[PDB]
Amino acid sequence: SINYILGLDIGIASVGWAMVEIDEEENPIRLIDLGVRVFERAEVPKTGDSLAMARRLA
RNA sequence: UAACUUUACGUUGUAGCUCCCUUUCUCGAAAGAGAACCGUUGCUACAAUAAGGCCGUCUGAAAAGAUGUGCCGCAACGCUCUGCCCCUUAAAGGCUUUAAGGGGCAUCGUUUA
């Protein structure tokens, strides 16, 4: 029900998101909601092996 | 990057031989020689190699036998199914239940046999 642009910042272990409500003419007027979502990055951390590798070996 | 077929080790447990050696026997004026339990060095063999769970075929009413280039098990992603949790709404007795609907996660699904 709100006219807003969603900005995403993506990295190997993080996604930051922001919502900015914009004008009728597409100009930003209000900062609505922002958050950060962090996860574990999809590799064996020290060596860069794949997470699946240990399972395939076994 | 996801997917293979095998080899060869290593680890542990058990068997034979073996290197040491702690105590306890027996001998012997010492030194030791042989022994018993255990420890454990080395060589060889077998079993297991995630912890756990299954199938196919043949003879049998079945029990079970026989049998095999037998199968899965540490991941990723997803919500079709199933489970837990969260929410919205409707109905009936802020409490409880039900239904529908929408999600998160998985002990659920797919890759996958």
UniProtKB/Swiss-Prot annotation:
List its uses: Coexpression with both gRNAs or a synthetic gRNA in human embryonic or pluripotent stem cells shows it is possible to target and modify a DNA sequence of interest.
The active site consists of: 9 (for ruvc-like nuclease domain)
Tell me the outcome of changing residue 9 to A. Answer: Does not restore CRISPR interference during plasmid transformation to deletion mutant
Superkingdom of the source species? Bacteria
What does the entry list as the binding residues for Mg(2+) 2?
Answer: 9
Where Mg(2+) 1 binds, per the record, is at: 9
Question: When this gene is knocked out, what is seen?
Answer: Almost no mature crRNA or tracrRNA produced. Loss of CRISPR interference during plasmid transformation.
Q: What does this protein do?
A: CRISPR (clustered regularly interspaced short palindromic repeat) is an adaptive immune system that provides protection against mobile genetic elements (viruses, transposable elements and conjugative plasmids). CRISPR clusters contain spacers, sequences complementary to antecedent mobile elements, and target invading nucleic acids. CRISPR clusters are transcribed and processed into CRISPR RNA (crRNA).
Q: What is known of its domains?
A: Has 2 endonuclease domains. The discontinuous RuvC-like domain cleaves the target DNA noncomplementary to crRNA while the HNH nuclease domain cleaves the target DNA complementary to crRNA.
The entry describes its oligomerization and partners as:
Monomer. Binds crRNA and tracrRNA.
The UniProt entry's sequence similarity note says: Belongs to the CRISPR-associated protein Cas9 family. Subtype II-C subfamily.
What is this protein's name? Answer: CRISPR-associated endonuclease Cas9
Q: Which organism does this sequence originate in?
A: Neisseria meningitidis serogroup C (strain 8013)
